[PDB]
UniProtKB/Swiss-Prot annotation, chain B:
Its EC number is 3.2.2.6, 3.2.2.-. Changing residue 473 to A: Does not affect phosphorylation level. It comes from Homo sapiens (Human). Changing residue 414 to A: Does not affect phosphorylation level. This is NAD(+) hydrolase SARM1.
UniProtKB/Swiss-Prot annotation, chain C:
The chain holds residues 61 to 184 of 724 of the full protein. NAD(+) 1 binds at residues 43, 50, 89-97. Belongs to the SARM1 family. It comes from Homo sapiens (Human). The TIR domain mediates NAD(+) hydrolase (NADase) activity. Self-association of TIR domains is required for NADase activity. This is NAD(+) hydrolase SARM1.
Length: 320, 480, 124
């Protein structure tokens, strides 16, 4: 009767685990082997995936034909009548038409994530689910959603390779009728201030606040060429106070520590300094140099690791 | 080999009978601890305990203990719940994952809502991590429900192992999810939560798996804009440049051929960070497979020709050094970087370009015809078919794909007067192949407004009419 | 052919061990002068010292002395800076240039800003 090849098509094109498990059990209780589920990224196929796709659907005669010609997944999506007839030894047009039916079934169930920029396969699928075979043919010509209104019928015939004129008319009709300086600077300590600074940057960029990070990237000998351009452009300032944050800022009477440079630059600018305390006691005013003693008079915010959302909202209520 | 199996089967029989028989409050957790300790003893055997641990997981599955663990995950007590979760974490093999996809989905998903204790979350993150590796249907059922939100909330923690489990969970979900799964991750900003996971200087594996997840999300062309707006691609290349693959190859015992096929389209997706991640991982795992004797897997899958394309078309020193080290640790030679001045090529550079990309059969064909770089840029269908003995159109089409890749990365300084290649590149980066075809006709920026379609077809040799229409439209609307 | 290699390897081993061990203000520059004088003796051999100088640059690279020179280029003293620069000038072979492109970019670029003394600039 021929239910075995239909079960092989169920296994090789499965989007459900139950029918695939039942088809694998049905092919296991019979006398033949079970096939494998194919990799959907067909433009990412090498030669072995093409050979496996040949072995699973019933083209075992033409396995040596594609291997000598070195046909990968990029050449399988772009194969025509003449290359099947002359170069591949597939002289019969009925065998070629069965191969194009299997190619239609393959190019329906395919992942085009490596080349589709504007999600053209879902545009083709919203009209008719058999239109998704020309996704590679329209993407490989350089098209997207913003360029289909200037495409003609000859460009779909010759370049995109759409042989049916009804599909060309429907694609043209549907293409014509419905288509047409950071703000928050964060200084942190190298030892235990990286994760809290990155977490503050993520929770501020969830609300659209542009945040500059990587002070340590500018610690490669660049003295003041980019720190001034970062802080002068920064609308606000966040001082991550790790446990032991201002230890290296004590007795630094030569302006060598980078966190001390950030504090002196922020006090020279006069920006809104918002300290973030993560288990850190307030240091003495007299042990710090006189160019940074004003940081102890700003309204700091204590950090809670299990109640972070209200703390981030309190930070957002204390910014511009 | 089979002695550890005969030592470990009846002990787990007695332990699973004790778990099935006793239903107390503290002896059940003690039995779970005994089974989990025997699992720890099973996985820690050098080159023995892999098949032993797979057989013991098969013995747990065939006894019915997986349904017992699914019952104990719904227990109201916390201690037996965390021991049942930590026992279920270490037994998720490819035969158990089918059973968990059949029944166990929805029970672990119920534990994904309880997020406050750390001892649940450290194991449930690993359970979801290994359950993202099953299929695309399980990825859709976890992302559409509250399975992705649990990982994206647990990325806020400071646990140096739970963040590893979350990084591997997002990486496996990006590898095995699909189009709609990547859309529901990135539209819910899953790439932004990897930023503390890509920067944390406490662990080195954690940043690597975070940048792996970032690169696999960045291999999708409909996604790359929000990933560049996330800012996590800037931390990939200094991380790969600052580390050495030999130490991370000695630290890790490799991955199978199914997972090796996931690292290959990282190199052919024309993004710098994804190519660096793929070259680093294939170099480390090529060192692993060169310690063993199974280096024929890369020739069966085909990553060697992609590494040769990385070396022969390198614009970065780090990915080129990693690809040269990966090809050196294998059994073949490394290629040389080509000279970009293709109109300045003589015959020997053309022969070298043939030898580096896989046209060793046609090396004697171009030498007798005296094809230099000027004739290589101006080669067509008929000269390949008749004069060069390349009768097959599929071989000609592979040669034109390699010619497209060559004429994309080419120096035209000897003939381009008005910088036409940057004019072609500003529209579409695949338009730079016709730079020689438009310059060789005598054109520049001040003459494209009087060019017709027939002049682009016959003289410039543009075979695609869509590209002809776009070039004519851009020549008419913005030049003059 | 290989006699100059066997004469020049343990002397550079002792000299790079003296550069790695001593961290003074004037003996380090004397060790840099000894290494640079042996480099001058290495490049001035008729049709012999090419592969010999390449092997000695490989021996300097595999010992870790290139990172030592990159550390001494960030020294606050001027004399050890100019001897480290003049030593780094004569050892830039195609295998060393990969290491300098990996790490050494940005340290030499920092010396590109200091332009007034001639003894730095002639070597940089
Ligand atoms: N030390 C540990 O605690 C430990 C170690 C490993 C696994 N586990 C547990 O095991 C479960 C996951 O294991 P898995 O089996 O599903 O892994 P997996 O299938 O997801 O990863 C592939 C593994 O299979 C191996 N492999 C498969 N085919 C191979 C081949 N042809 N040649 C060489 N190697 C091949 C690879 O080496 C690789 O380790 C999890 O529960 C995990 O916690 C624990
Ligand atoms: N007298 C000196 O002080 C002296 C002389 C030479 C080099 N150096 C130093 O060496 C470094 C640069 O040397 P380099 O090796 O990088 O030079 P290079 O590679 O930039 O220049 C090419 C050199 O390699 C030789 N060469 C390479 N392949 C050859 C081949 N197949 N056949 C014949 N000759 C071949 C050439 O003769 C030529 O001298 C610098 O630091 C420079 O100061 C110093």
């Amino acid at each position: 009767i021929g239910a075995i090849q239909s079960l092989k098509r169920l296994v090789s094109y499965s989007t459900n685990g139950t029918k695939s498990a039942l088809a694998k059990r049905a092919l296991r209780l019979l006398g033949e082997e079970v096939p494998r589920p194919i990799l959907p990224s067909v433009p990412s196929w090498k030669e072995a995936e093409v050979q496996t796709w040949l072995q699973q659907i019933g083209f075992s005669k033409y396995c040596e034909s594609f291997r000598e010609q070195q046909v990968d997944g990029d050449l399988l999506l772009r194969l025509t009548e003449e290359e099947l007839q002359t170069d591949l030894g597939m002289k019969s047009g009925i065998t070629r038409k069965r191969f194009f039916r299997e190619l239609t079934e393959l190019k329906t169930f395919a992942n085009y994530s490596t080349c589709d920029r504007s999600n053209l396969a879902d545009w083709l699928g919203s009209l008719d689910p058999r239109f998704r075979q020309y996704t590679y043919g329209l993407v490989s010509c350089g098209l997207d959603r913003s360029l289909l209104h200037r495409v003609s019928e000859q460009q779909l015939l010759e370049d995109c390779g759409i042989h049916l004129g009804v599909h060309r008319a429907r694609i043209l009709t549907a293409a014509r009728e419905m288509l047409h300086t950071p703000d928050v600077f964060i200084s942190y300590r190298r030892n235990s201030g990286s994760q809290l600074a990155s977490l503050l940057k993520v929770h501020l960029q969830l609300h659209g606040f542009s945040v500059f990070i990587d002070v340590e990237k500018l610690e490669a000998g660049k003295f003041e060429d980019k720190l001034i351009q970062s802080v002068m452009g920064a609308r606000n300032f966040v001082l991550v106070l790790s446990p032991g944050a201002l230890d290296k800022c004590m007795q630094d009477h030569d302006c060598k520590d980078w966190v001390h440079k950030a504090i002196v630059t922020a006090l020279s600018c006069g920006k809104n300094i918002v300290p973030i305390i993560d288990g850190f006691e307030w240091p003495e005013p007299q042990v710090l140099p006189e160019d940074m003693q004003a940081v102890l008079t700003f309204n700091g915010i204590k950090w809670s690791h299990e109640y972070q959302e209200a703390t981030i909202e309190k930070i957002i209520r204390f910014l511009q | 080999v089979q002695d550890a199996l005969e030592r470990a089967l009846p002990e787990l029989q007695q332990a699973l009978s004790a778990l099935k028989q006793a239903g107390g409050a503290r002896a059940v957790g003690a039995g779970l601890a005994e089974v989990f300790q025997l699992v720890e003893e099973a996985w820690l055997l050098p080159a023995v305990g892999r098949e032993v641990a797979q057989g013991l997981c098969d013995a747990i599955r065939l006894d019915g203990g997986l349904d017992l663990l699914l019952r104990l995950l719904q227990a109201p007590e916390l201690e037996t719940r965390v021991q049942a979760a930590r026992l279920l974490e270490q037994i998720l093999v490819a035969e158990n994952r089918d059973r968990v996809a059949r029944i166990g989905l929805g029970v672990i998903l119920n534990l994904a809502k309880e997020r406050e204790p750390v001892e649940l979350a450290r194991s449930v993150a690993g359970i979801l991590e290994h359950m993202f590796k099953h299929s695309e249907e399980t990825c859709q059922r976890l992302v559409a429900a509250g399975g992705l939100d649990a990982v994206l909330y647990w990325c806020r923690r400071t646990d140096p192992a739970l963040l590893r489990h979350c990084a591997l969970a997002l990486g496996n979900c990006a590898l095995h999810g699909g189009q709609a799964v990547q859309r529901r991750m990135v539209e819910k900003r899953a790439a932004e939560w990897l930023f503390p996971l890509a920067f944390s200087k406490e662990d080195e594996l954690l940043r690597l798996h975070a940048c792996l997840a970032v690169a696999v999300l960045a291999t999708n062309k409909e996604v790359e804009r929000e990933v560049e707006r996330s800012g996590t691609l800037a931390l990939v290349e200094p991380l790969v440049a600052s580390l050495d693959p030999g130490r991370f190859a000695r630290c890790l015992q490799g991955r199978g051929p199914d997972d090796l096929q996931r690292l290959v389209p990282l190199l052919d997706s024309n993004r710098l960070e994804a190519q660096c991640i793929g070259a680093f991982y294939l170099c480390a795992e090529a060192a692993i497979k060169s310690l063993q004797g199974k280096t024929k897997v890369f020739s069966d899958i085909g990553a060697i020709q992609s590494l040769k394309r990385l070396v022969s078309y390198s614009t970065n020193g780090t990915k080129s050094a990693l690809a040269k080290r990966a090809l050196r640790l294998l059994g073949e030679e490394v290629p040389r970087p080509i000279l970009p001045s293709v109109p300045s090529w003589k015959e020997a550079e053309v022969q070298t370009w043939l030898q580096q990309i896989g046209f060793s059969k046609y090396c004697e064909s171009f030498r007798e015809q005296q094809v230099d770089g000027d004739l290589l840029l101006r080669l067509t269908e008929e000269e390949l078919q008749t004069d060069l003995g390349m009768k097959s159109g599929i071989t000609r089409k592979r040669f034109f794909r390699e010619l497209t890749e060559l004429k994309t990365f080419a120096n035209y300084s000897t003939c381009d007067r008005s910088n036409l290649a940057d004019w072609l590149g500003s529209l579409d980066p695949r338009f730079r192949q016709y730079t020689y075809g438009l310059v060789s006709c005598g054109l520049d920026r001040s003459l494209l407004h009087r060019v017709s379609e027939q002049q682009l077809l016959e003289d410039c040799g543009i075979h695609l009419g869509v590209h002809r229409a776009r070039i004519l439209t851009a020549a008419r609307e913005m030049l003059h």
